[PDB]
């Protein structure tokens, strides 16, 4: 019945409309479902007192129609009043849009982010690390180890090696996970080379993971560098498992390549 009052040109009746387009949005959802869609008219009409709320009620109404890109573009263009509420049955409806579209966008941004990159909204990436702070702050880290893979981002994953969860062997068995679920070489060696440098910058430098990564990684000089750190440290008992896992699990050509860096 509030569909009739859309030719007023006093925009205060339109904000009286969106005053009624949010709270009782389910019974007239039947009524105006596909009939009238003048959200963009006042949302773009410089009689603004309705723009930063206008895309909210469109993002409500198109949901059970489907229209996840309609309510997703309006979810990004809805501003501060949209994401301010997470105490409903609607935050699950919108992060399943935005986080999924963000990470399947970031598959392309793992392919080609350089050149023809996409205009990622700061909320499109902002509720990513915001809800990721909900992951870090809501005590769950078998998932907070996971969404950091899902965003295809290295430095947030390197960031959460030091969190409210500790490292007994945590963040080490996660590479036993990622080695199993690992897709290609391209994402593999990038995370692989960056974790084993804070493994050397760790208090007790683990040797079997930095040997295993390097035969998984083809660095014929870094094992001569930490091998120089173990000759400089001068204990062949800890210069042992770094070297016989190397002889056991390395290639013949890889040892014939690393041998020059050992002897020099």
């Amino acid at each position: 019945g509030i569909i009739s009052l859309l030719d007023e040109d006093e925009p205060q009746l339109k904000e009286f409309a969106l005053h009624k387009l949010n709270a009782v949005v389910n019974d007239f959802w039947a009524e105006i479902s596909e009939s009238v869609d003048k959200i963009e008219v006042l949302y773009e009409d410089e009689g603004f007192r309705s723009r930063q709320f206008a895309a909210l009620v469109a993002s409500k109404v198109f949901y059970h129609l489907g229209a996840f890109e309609e309510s997703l573009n309006y979810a990004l263009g809805a501003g501060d009043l949209f994401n301010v509420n997470d105490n409903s049955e609607y935050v699950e409806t919108i992060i399943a849009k935005c986080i999924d579209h963000y990470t399947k966008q970031c598959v392309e941004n793992a392919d080609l982010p350089e050149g023809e990159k996409k205009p990622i909204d700061q909320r499109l990436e902002g509720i990513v690390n915001k809800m990721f702070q909900r992951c870090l702050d809501d005590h769950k880290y078998k998932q907070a180890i996971g969404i950091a893979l899902e965003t295809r981002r290295l430095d947030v994953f390197e960031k959460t090696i030091l969190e409210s969860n500790d490292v007994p062997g945590m963040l080490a068995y996660s590479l036993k996970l990622c080695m199993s679920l690992m897709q290609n070489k391209q994402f593999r060696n990038k995370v692989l080379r960056v974790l084993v440098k804070i493994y050397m910058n760790l208090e007790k430098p683990d040797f079997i993971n930095v040997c295993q990564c390097l035969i998984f990684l083809d660095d014929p000089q870094a094992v001569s560098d930490i091998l120089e750190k173990l000759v400089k440290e001068d204990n062949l008992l800890m210069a042992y498992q770094i070297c016989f896992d190397l002889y056991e699990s390395a290639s013949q050509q890889f040892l014939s390549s690393v041998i020059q860096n050992l002897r020099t």
Binding site: K142, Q143, G146, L149, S180, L181
Partner: protein, 32 residues
């Protein structure tokens, strides 16, 4: 763990996809 529960379960969707195409091939090949 819960993180492997989805990736290792779509892994058998990739593993699952090939087989109907396979019996699709053998469906004509056993005829001819």
């Amino acid at each position: 763990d819960l993180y492997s529960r989805y990736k290792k379960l779509q892994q058998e969707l990739e593993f699952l996809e090939v087989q109907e195409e396979y019996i699709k091939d053998e469906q004509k090949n056993l005829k001819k």
